[PDB]
């Protein structure tokens, strides 16, 4: 039975435990929701004013139009635009938090934080045009943080975290269509305005606004990665493990869940100090483990093992060994606060704008990060003690994970084959066919799709066709939990050409073995790292991104953030697969813009395909079409 | 039949014409939508991620909770918060537009605009703390415009268009609850973040965020009024007319519809220049008439007659005499673009973010306002010529309207009774019972309510109980179209005490007659004028706004902007009636917060009441409770 819910064996085992214990899960709540509303599924519902709710029958007779006259086209486009703005609001709110934290750190107001990556700080300053010669690091960083904050509002320049991160030719194409954001929060607000009742009512105009707001989301992502690297270190290759078997019955198990490394990075460092305090309580130590993006952040930088991801997050609690779940914001099922009553887990919120009824709230202030962390960890230690003598059921299931492939690390790895032209070995192998193209897997799991089934099915076909696969967020989580980040699986998973390249790079890096089958490029904001890599390739080749054999797949998408990311992938020029239905099919004109005529605007386009084998074929076709456009064999 | 749709006779006549001509109206589209979705009506629907749509049965069995675990409380509060943010995005986008226009004007970049009200400019600068002594007006205005723009983002001060417009004691109460906005667009974005999936999931916390975002909406409203007064003149009493009978078969009839006086003010002035050009085309002249808020703006400042409002806007076109409908944004039924095919009206959009498929778009640039206006008006003249010899059906129905009661004008009128303490005559008459209290009517019509029936039913009962009634937006539109702004109706409509006061003020102003039964305080952003009046009363009395016998009624609310306004009315301390159901009844805890326990936070509260006689009784009870709290008879 449980295989229809998740393809992860550890998740299946915990689903069996939840069932016999009567603990309701996300899958049970989904079953209880069926059949879901077909107006909502197709996008043909509007609640943007108190004359509503309005709906439109996909087919048949009336209602055919909204009460104010809004057509199916308008309703669908307005709902989509609001989702893009909501995603932009999340990624950029994360980035804004980090910008204020950096400012505080270098103003002397938060001594738990510091410039850890001086090289990253100077390179960002150079990219932005901020002078470094003869300046103190703290002054350079103050200027970077102020520039970050300035990109949220209108000013004399557009959003620099768009215009300084894409090639000039791409910026020119976007500017010609009016798509460069003027300010991050400015664009979010303009979306909410133009989609309110009696405002924008032309599908093309609305969708152009959405594309521009998606670039505000990209700017937030890139800003988040940049600032987190300065504060916490740019990732480099690291070896760790994933899945529920990383929990340890004899340790205090603490999950960091949510998004921002401002919180999870301090938890990691403070946890090591309190080891002896944990031992006094009868534990071996504090075992910090990751869930969702903030787990990815500490996996990428510190090798903290990943417990689980996205849709299966409740299953970590069902083991009975999760003593604490420490939260900041985004992608946290609020069910965790009630499940904790039955599992014993202490669920702790820390951010003023993200509370859950029934969860313990411990305000976290960057100015008091270490002390606030100790208060939180001491709640976890008390919880470990309370479970003295209780059996736990930790599935003895884990994989080996090689990760930490920031763009800097990928360039460094390649530089071992060509020191002064590090991108050339990659391009050479694209040209000779050893690498067919590149595919970025991104985004969530979604309860509608058996967990991980689309990521793994698509990835397997692409890897066998010599596609270089990179991954972020819970797409990276899916692939790591299924062995795709273990170099021991290269022979099984990779075509001969891809294997040759991964082996050549690995052996040049002293590994006596290959790079892993899939390169983990980090959290969801770290989709911006894939942008940096692709933009660097484009610049080295002297072509725009919409000529490169690079595609993206949000194969099991869920969050509004994933819609925003998919939309900016299209906007920067990529064929972009989405493996769940976004609420667009109720308007053929809108679907045709997003899947076809946007090619004429940005060169990218959505590929909506729920069958993963077919999605892989379509992604391969998109890659091979790009190869043919460059005059390459395929 | 038509009386169930609208209580306005002119609207009824045009509904008969639309019916025999087969032209579908908002009322027909509403009928086609019935029965509307009960999940949406109650707030128990969520589409915030691609696992949805989710719904919760108001009563009965499953579904009882959203797929991610979101409760009814969370779902209802998140939807409400998004509506507040959308309203804030509209009012503040309007204000932002005006701030950029003022900046351009005084930088020499838009010579069609200028500082028209020097007195207002200096008083705003003084309120904000901007020095004026020894400064050029253009420099003072540059500083005001920059301060306006700065309130959209975080900075070293909170939003000054909140903190400098409410009494210190009210700011202190709000600050204690964390409710002062940090930046207008900042708060909009934070709402969209915290309401996205897996973020804020505590109803009280979510609603506190909503209250804070409503204050960002108030700041946008107040900023909009302030800047429009500087650019276009602070209103003073003016006499005009309203309803469809203000159209003239032998003139070029041009409706200004939407919101921003940056557009409608120029149309008014340029139209007078082109009179002879219109006469050459066989017209008597150009007859500019108003619809919705931008109509209110030019009615308040110039006495431009109001044609119609809100829900009945299509009926102006049905006359056959509306040659042009000139739009910027907000509250425009997009049906107008298709109805125009059948009526001959030229519908013209002018703003980049607000287009309607099938409508002619004429970009308007403040830098070219006069020329762009002439292009627009020449389309209208061509349209008049095309209807040579066609019969029109203009209902011969109009009322007399005295309006222009800005807060400055109200203070000036009262100063004729007490020159150096102008608020005292008003307070004296509250104390002696000649004025029972004050009621602000605000907001839209809504197709669910027979048009104007709640505004007029409630207003009549309050006026008979000696309540001083003020009105804005389409509440003012409803009341003007039913004679409530004609001083000749004071004897019929007003209790003896109110009549005595209106007569005493009018006779002291040289009128030989009373002020009108209802004081028109302007457009919906000009709800901020009512705030200025109430805050001035509070300061003169040394008490906070939640002790004053002042209430608000959004008696037929529709737009997200009306939800935002109602919410900030509650947040500043007022009992606030809403005469349509907002999507809250699916959560009793949320309803109880908004109608009861918020009293303990801000002193205000919502009164949700769809029966207008009962609503009037509840508003009177709220007024009389405030009187009793002040130790006054009632
Ligand atoms: S905006 Fe138009 S379509 Fe949407 S709920 Fe209001 S009347 Fe219906
Ligand atoms: S956010 Fe939760 S309640 Fe809303 S659609 Fe997604 S799963 Fe359903
Ligand atoms: S952290 Fe969230 S946005 Fe998707 S990628 Fe994972 S569920
Ligand atoms: S202009 Fe719009 S917000 Fe309501 S008050 Fe009139 S319908
Ligand atoms: S009618 Fe179901 S989503 Fe609105
Ligand atoms: S189920 Fe009808 S509004 Fe969503
Ligand atoms: Fe994430
Ligand atoms: Fe309005
Ligand atoms: Ni994500
Ligand atoms: Ni309004």
Curated annotation (Swiss-Prot), chains A, B:
Quaternary assembly: Homodimer.
**Any notes on this protein's domains?**
Cluster B is an all-cysteinyl-liganded 4Fe-4S cluster; cluster C is a mixed Ni-Fe-S cluster which is the active site of CO oxidation. Cluster D is also an all-cysteinyl-liganded 4Fe-4S cluster that bridges the two subunits of the CODH dimer.
What UniProt keywords apply to this chain's record, in alphabetical order? 4Fe-4S, Cell membrane, Cytoplasm, Iron, Iron-sulfur, Membrane, Metal-binding, Nickel, Oxidoreductase
Q: What catalytic reaction does the record list?
A: CO + 2 oxidized [2Fe-2S]-[ferredoxin] + H2O = 2 reduced [2Fe-2S]-[ferredoxin] + CO2 + 2 H(+)
Q: Name one GO cellular component term.
A: plasma membrane
- Which residues are listed as membrane-spanning? none
- Cofactor stoichiometry and binding? Binds 3 [4Fe-4S] clusters per homodimer. Binds 2 [Ni-4Fe-5S] clusters per homodimer.
Q: Which gene encodes it?
A: cooS2
Functional note: CODH oxidizes carbon monoxide coupled, via CooF, to the reduction of a hydrogen cation by a hydrogenase (possibly CooH).
E.C. number, please? 1.2.7.4
What is stated about the way this protein's activity is regulated? Inactivated by O(2).
Annotated [4Fe-4S] cluster 1 binding sites = 37, 45
UniProt lists the family membership as follows: Belongs to the Ni-containing carbon monoxide dehydrogenase family.
Q: Where does [Ni-4Fe-5S] cluster bind?
A: 259, 293, 331, 444, 474, 524
Task: Name a GO molecular-function annotation.
Answer: 4 iron, 4 sulfur cluster binding
- What is the topology of this protein in the membrane according to its UniProt annotation? Peripheral membrane protein
* InterPro entries (UniProt xref): CO_DH_a-bundle (IPR016101), CODH (IPR010047), HCP/CODH (IPR004137), Prismane-like_a/b-sand (IPR016099), Prismane-like_sf (IPR011254)
Q: Any idea what this protein is called? A: Carbon monoxide dehydrogenase 2
Tree of life domain: Bacteria
Cofactor(s) the protein requires to work: [4Fe-4S] cluster; [Ni-4Fe-5S] cluster
Q: Where in the cell is it found?
A: Cytoplasm; Cell membrane
